[PDB]
Design a protein around this ligand. Sequence first.
Ligand SMILES: Cc1c(-c2c(F)cc(C(N)=O)c3[nH]c4c(c23)CC[C@H](C(C)(C)O)C4)cccc1-n1c(=O)c2cccc(F)c2n(C)c1=O
Length: 261
Amino acid sequence: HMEIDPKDLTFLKELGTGQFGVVKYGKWRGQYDVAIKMIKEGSMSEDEFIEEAKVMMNLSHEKLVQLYGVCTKQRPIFIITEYMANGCLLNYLREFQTQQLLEMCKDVCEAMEYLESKQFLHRDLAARNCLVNDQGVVKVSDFGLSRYVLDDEYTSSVGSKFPVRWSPPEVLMYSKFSSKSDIWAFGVLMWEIYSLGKMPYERFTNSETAEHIAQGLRLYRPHLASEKVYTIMYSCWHEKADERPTFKILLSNILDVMDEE
Ligand SMILES: Cc1c(-c2c(F)cc(C(N)=O)c3[nH]c4c(c23)CC[C@H](C(C)(C)O)C4)cccc1-n1c(=O)c2cccc(F)c2n(C)c1=O
């Protein structure tokens, strides 16, 4: 537990509004640049999140957005994190050489291999919650947070905000989350990266996407992805969770394609 005193925070710029409300840029104890997420009441199970936040502090990796602490002796609670000046990867992609696109995949895969080693599920990996720092390094953010979301539009499988397009068959059929459902989502993320932020299965509704996936249909090769890169993303989408690679394997596959291309 790392309780941050709000008196040690400054509020310097408004970054916008996310799923949980207002996000600000500020400084913590004049030392760290931070993002301050102000968690609107009724949007998150705070008690359950606060228990898990102690586990989230201990997660430390260069490619994971660092949790610095929380402000919980008030409502709304604040989540204090590492500041990523270029915002989310989806908007960064939408605003590159093929080598830079693979380095973005490598960055995320390093973070995911670390989470996989800690048996910590992200649960909602996608370009919208990967963040980009001032040097163009991509880092994974909001890992594990979707388990504490209270809005039905995000939690229900038929909700308007459920990430159907990033979900494997066992999630759509049984809500069975595992390291292998994070692998599936990672493949969709690689597709997003190589498609410069296009929506996956854009031609389909969420209901039509679940049906397409049930028939064995998969996302097509983006033109910026080579055959070797597409083989990696496609390996993430095996119908059987047990036949999907680990993040450890994926990272080795990515490093091989980099050295070769
Ligand atoms: C990421 C995000 C943040 C956000 C955050 F949380 C954490 C940090 C960090 N740790 O530093 C952070 N840093 C910056 C932002 C930001 C935003 C951009 C800033 C600049 C300086 C570049 O203007 C820099 C804040 C509000 C909304 C969203 N946001 C989006 O911007 C977004 C887009 C498409 C699609 C989506 F789904 C999106 N969603 C849902 C969403 O929450």
